[PDB]
């Protein structure tokens, strides 16, 4: 593939991708427990533990019901003084002490209630999607690290992934899973996770071609070539990416979609330019620009191009039909009737809670009558 | 494009979309803090604050680990009486008071614990996806309003969006972001958000064409035209939408996919009908109906059509090969062997909590012995 | 369609799918209330209820703002002794009792605060997506069971779904919804849910064809056929699935994409093999294998095939151009320069909380001076 001789034919070099073939996934089963084991002094904590269980039931019961509906489709003077003293003792012993003791277990109960609530939130974060959609979920990073015991070296080694594969796999969301079974009373869900096996085709590189209009002897012409062509070593072939997943780094296809390329097209791509079926534009709309990673290419030889906020027209020095516009002059270009903006940077911000100041507890002072008793003795 | 003369050829007018070209996104960085600054009487709150920190660590550590694995891919008698009194004072001063004072800080601790838990839930709602999937997330509306300080007029002004663009952008989910870095101990994540720059092509309208079978001199025929044709002013061109995002209002493509249209096709679309490559149907299955926004069009001149629950056959008055069925007669139509239902309305419902009634607190009465002391004095 | 005679031409039978046409969805409106009705002793609970309301406001206000921005686009000695006794009574009555009574309502307040927090978490689980993305969300299973009162028999009956439809609908995520209106002060959102109406085309089966290279008289050849062909009874037609949703069980298309098939292709598919436009491979890359549900087919007659970890070469007995490799011998195959792995099983694991042990409450002993009073009397 020779680009220098295609540029003058109106074909602009586009993005480059590697080429991978997707095979059957590896499977790993994980059981997620929603109700923690809390034991000891059950009579003290009981009330908060039961409300928690109802939260879990309300979340899991709809999963069980859906799985049953789909059962066939799921894959798997001294006397008076003493009387006063005893009366006071009575009120302390019958009212004050019993209340304080009850408050001590209300406190433990609430502490457990908070701890349980946070545990649910941790699960909601990691296995949220699993609970929300029993079929075909996207697996989170927290769920993955749990699966491999927080060891990504082991993850890569077992799957045979490079750092580049982990990145594009997470980008596309190719790690998926399903709930196969649940136990509502126990608070258990059985989640099955599928980890894809990707294979790299050696030296196979996919090259995008972006044709735009150009002028020649007269009139306006467009050259017609496949948008995507596959090059390996010295071989060229046609591909169809409409059924493939495309990431920034590679094209991931199930099966191998390469097909034989015609002689005439091979000729053009390699620099012949003898044929390159160019077609005359008479009563059709055709493109006059192409965009690649922020670069703007345009046929400013045919149409009127302008740089905004400099109020300056754009022209060509000839020797080419396609010019690259310089992004260092302005943010907005006009090509024909279309205004093209660029990806400028906006200032940094933050999200946070307001600062919180706590006040002191109410503290009861000690009762000290030593100075009075001393004067009675 | 002249529809009246295409109807008699078996081509039914379909949906209409505008046409837009997607360029490089604008970038804005936001730092999200998961641990709030709570200060004052640290000895009182400490215990609940530490459990919260462990929740945050369990959520963020897997993000840090994944980012490191992907480091190369991430973009960025009086004496006895006194003895009794002092004994009672002792039990109050050594047992009752110390317990009450401890309960006062247990209460403050629990209050902080609840407040912290709710803060996490707010973050889980707005930045949930960011934490779950470090690469290529969909940005929530809460995260967006945070970015623009709850001012959507500013949002639209900076990006150059109309209300129609904000709607279709949220519909498709074109606002994306990534975590670039984290600090597990600090509880910080650095989230980068990409806001797309869409440009409108003036007067460019995409029109869907839906061919069905029809009869003529004899036998059964189907006319073959591209499903999508692009019309601007007086110009027609071919497009390929298999690589574009399609919303209810518009087709959003990266780069411009328009290509020159052949003379013969232009002729047909504009009403010539001289060629319109019609092909004979001999041993193939072909469509006899078309659906558009609930409208059902059918070739009831060729096949048998019926209106269900009226038990009434459907017929044509001729003068056309395509008839539109009236949705005011029945909900289910039969065309040939296929039963076609319509989008009926189901009754309104609600989701809510059961009403909760609270009981009163236990209240300790005051100790009043004034009437007894008065009789001793 | 006759496969035995296509195998020798290099065409391998692929996956089989049913064929369905998607029509207008049924609509059901549900109102979700985020603030529960808690009443009684309002002076005791008030403080925690107000903090909860602020959580709800922070989540809903951005939804209201977005809806307003999009308003035009949204679809809808004895005396001294008595003095000591009264002094002690004073400290109990003025310090100890008031504090204990306050702790009793602090306890009720905290209990309500926990209960409210959990309710929000339940909503975040079921209607999370609705709050996060006001436009075009995926509906969760919890939201669906709420809509049908936890009765999936009613769900299937009303929609006319079979268990197979519920499964593939949840798999693809075809149940969608939008927030049409909100009330921030009331804590209400109005969520509209669209349930798709799918219709099955009788006997319509889509068959995938996977061509690979083969040898014949000499040189290397590839036969070119459409990847997907539609067969009904005795009729064959061409389809285009690039615009359709594909599930494991079926192809779900809006409208009907079948078009007439050419005579020559019908001939080949039915076993003629007279034409089958076979093309010579001269300077192109072509596939030498095909993958289907873990099965690996390969042209080991043309290239070199090996079984890894057995260190054994793979050969053919002839009588065929395509051989199926046996997955019971090894996990990794080499075909040409490409290493193909298989979906092996990884061991079962679990996610859970550490077991928690609770200690006892602090219990205040009763004050017993009966033995001393008895010696004074
Ligand atoms: C727990 O409460 C029950 C009454 O529901 C009581 O019978 C039992 O003895 C209590 N157990 C303890 C250890 O307090
Ligand atoms: C008061 O008298 C009691 C008699 O038992 C004695 O124990 C106590 O220490 C005396 N208090 C003072 C201040 O002398
Ligand atoms: C906090 O607790 C520590 C013991 O862990 C103690 O040394 C310190 O004095 C306490 N500070 C306050 C203000 O109570
Ligand atoms: C009881 O006697 C004490 C002596 O100090 C006095 O202060 C108190 O008011 C008297 N109480 C009554 C009810 O007379
Ligand atoms: C509630 O508190 C207010 C003061 O904010 C007070 O006026 C009112 O009487 C109290 N009501 C009850 C039932 O305690
Ligand atoms: C002490 O004397 C009082 C006088 O009212 C009497 O009620 C109480 O029972 C006596 N206590 C004992 C242990 O005798």
Residue numbers in the entry:
A (entry chain A), B (entry chain C), C (entry chain B): 23 to 98, 159 to 459
Text from the published report:
Langya virus (LayV) was recently found in shrews and isolated from febrile patients in China, representing the first human-infecting HNV from shrew origin. HNV infections are facilitated by the attachment glycoprotein (G) and the fusion glycoprotein (F). Upon G-mediated receptor engagement, F is triggered and promotes membrane fusion and viral entry. LayV F and G are closely related to MojV F and G but distantly related to their NiV and HeV counterparts.
To understand the molecular basis of 4G5 binding to LayV F, we determined a cryoEM structure of 4G5 Fab-bound postfusion F at 3.5 Å resolution. Local refinements of the 4G5-bound membrane-proximal region and of the membrane-distal base yielded reconstructions at 3.4 and 3.2 Å, respectively. EM analysis of negatively stained samples revealed binding of one 4G5 Fab to prefusion F and of three Fabs to postfusion F. Postfusion LayV F forms a ~150 Å-high and ~70 Å-wide conical trimer with a prominent triple helical bundle assembled from the central helices and HR1, surrounded by three antiparallel HR2 helices yielding a 6-helix bundle at one end of the trimer. The opposite end of the molecule forms a triangular base. Glycans at positions N65 and N459 are resolved at the periphery of the elongated trimer. Although F refolding affects a large fraction of the trimer, the N-terminus, the β-rich domains comprising residues 281 to 420, and the upstream helix remain mostly unchanged, besides modification of their relative orientations.
